[PDB]
């Protein structure tokens, strides 16, 4: 089997991407944030505190003839940005782009933090990291991809995020028309439950490539590119007027600037992030100070190859017995 679904930026900045997901019988379609940095599939629901729902589409398990309460199961998750959600668990039929899993754990939110309430475009998350991170207790649950894996033509999914435009998540196959050149594969450590790999270095604009190992995670659920302070300093030093602002919470730059590209290494291959991808617009409406798409990972504890990086590539998440990551230009 295979699946193929279009993923769409939620706003003009590509702050996140939503992908339609069919849940239950008859289908209830929710737009979920596919997140290779977490491993819970959770949804706004009929159980969600009513004051914490503001525009989202909800899953109503009582209207699904295939929904079954997973007795005693609860979940609770906190994300790197400080947002959180929690609730109980159903199993139900979940389909993504024609690909169907029966008995998928669908985690029903009873509570969500303000950040989720305030984002009316995101109806929940579909986690695609390793199932070892799944927060369901007392019986940990498998991700959609883990459940689908055996049925897939090939145990892979691919992320093809668009810059200010729709893209694609494919399951079970590699679309050889979706990228240019070759796919370069690189080793993954699952030790922290993430798609964790080591970039071989970086370049700023037309500058020379610096060979240096950068351990990080491929995370579709993080908007920006978070790298070591040395790297990030080297990047923003090439932008006149750029500075790290503690009041804003990161590097800002004059909106009048033309940003240089940023290249990261995948083995011997190179992925080029165009400068425009690194512009996240005015810090506040009408401001001439713009927020940078490359930020320091210092104090995060891990480097994150978020959407800013991933959207510059065709990315293969290879879930073979020994997982790997593949990157191609496109």
Swiss-Prot record:
Q: Domain Peptidase A1 spans what residues? A: 17-328
Please give a single GO biological process term from the UniProt record: proteolysis
Q: Which UniProt keywords apply?
A: Aspartyl protease, Disulfide bond, Hydrolase, Protease, Signal, Zymogen
**Can you list the disulfide-bonded cysteine pairs?**
255-290
Give the domain of life. Eukaryota
The molecular function terms of the Gene Ontology recorded here are: aspartic-type endopeptidase activity
Catalysed reaction(s)?
A: Hydrolysis of proteins with specificity similar to that of pepsin A, prefers hydrophobic residues at P1 and P1', but does not cleave 14-Ala-|-Leu-15 in the B chain of insulin or Z-Glu-Tyr. Clots milk
| Catalytic residues in the record | 35, 199
**What EC designation does it have?**
3.4.23.22
Q: What family is this protein classified in?
A: Belongs to the peptidase A1 family.
User: What is the name of the protein in this document?
Assistant: Endothiapepsin
- Record the organism: Cryphonectria parasitica
Question: Which portion of the complete protein is shown here?
Answer: 90 to 419 of 419
